Write a protein that binds this ligand. Sequence first.
Ligand SMILES: *[C@]1(C(=O)O)O[C@@H]([C@H](O)[C@H](O)CO)[C@H](O)[C@@H](O)[C@H]1F
Ligand code: NA
Length: 382
Amino acid sequence: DPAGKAAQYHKEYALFRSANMPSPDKLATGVGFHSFRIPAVVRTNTGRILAFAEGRRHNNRDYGDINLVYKRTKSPTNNGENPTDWESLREVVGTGPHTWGNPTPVVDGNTIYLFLSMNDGAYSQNGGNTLPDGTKTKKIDSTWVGRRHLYLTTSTDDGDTWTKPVDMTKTLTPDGQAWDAVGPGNGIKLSTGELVIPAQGRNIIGRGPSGNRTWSMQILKGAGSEGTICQTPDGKLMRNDRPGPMGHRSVARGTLAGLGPFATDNGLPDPACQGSILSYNSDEPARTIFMNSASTDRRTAMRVRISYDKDAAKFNFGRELKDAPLGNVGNEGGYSSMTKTSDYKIGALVESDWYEDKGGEKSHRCIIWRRFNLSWIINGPN
Ligand SMILES: *[C@]1(C(=O)O)O[C@@H]([C@H](O)[C@H](O)CO)[C@H](O)[C@@H](O)[C@H]1F
Ligand code: NA
């Protein structure tokens, strides 16, 4: 790989700073956040980087009052190189005591589409959970009030502002469904111009001229809840999904006409956690990048890998992110998101956990921004 001849480059720092950290991230209203989780990142066609997360207000739990927040690079050209290259925290949507999350963006010319999941603030995936006011959540169910919804917001000004989110649940989620997820992480634009967004048990497909899309569902058999999508160099689609049981990624390949069966990929261990994937380039040699916790049982084994295969069948060992560790951010590892920057770097957001209350709801969570070049990955010790 000719990119492996270059000098290695890596740089890393916290981008979403939890309430317990110095200079914690807050909205201009003064609203701060206990934890930030569930990253999503995209480079827009200006070169500006948009980073999204769940601002989890009161604790680290996936239910409750959670606002979908973001930051942009201050200019289209700075590539998020340094902490001061980023704007202060802003909000996409935070209405009510509800959960707004699962950011799943895709860039489509001069429009950025952002899919997201939502539930009413009184409900949680398991039910029976205690909220900050002492009330107990109901279990997410199939009722309109109690189900997980799917919303869509758009920006036509390089992420400066966002439309009022549109509830698309009635057309883009199956009738009768209770729990649901979109992404989280990102969707894609195909070489043929369609948009594909990964969701629980399905793809969401956007068709039409750039910026004037209409959306349909592609229902999948055996897909996971939290999926990733990419178009591999052969032009085919691939779903690489978080498994139900801990063990390995679950993968399927196909086209807009349908995907083949999902099967466990024994080359990609995974602890039942979200991962991310990126078509880095389609020219020779074509590269697909994959990031997850490369472990059957913990989230603290983050690994970025390259595949040169036309169908991304096999990835290399790649590189452990602990080779460029960051102090003063807790224990790095968890959900992740990747984009390619204008200056030929991979930009990755990666969750980190201060772990103060161990697995408990009071442990503060923050998000790291990493940039690295192919050389950094290629020339990893292993
Ligand atoms: C995530 C996690 O940290 O494991 O889990 C998902 C969800 O609980 C699982 O996919 C099982 O359905 C949450 O939606 C996400 O916010 C995060 F917590
Ligand atoms: Na809110």
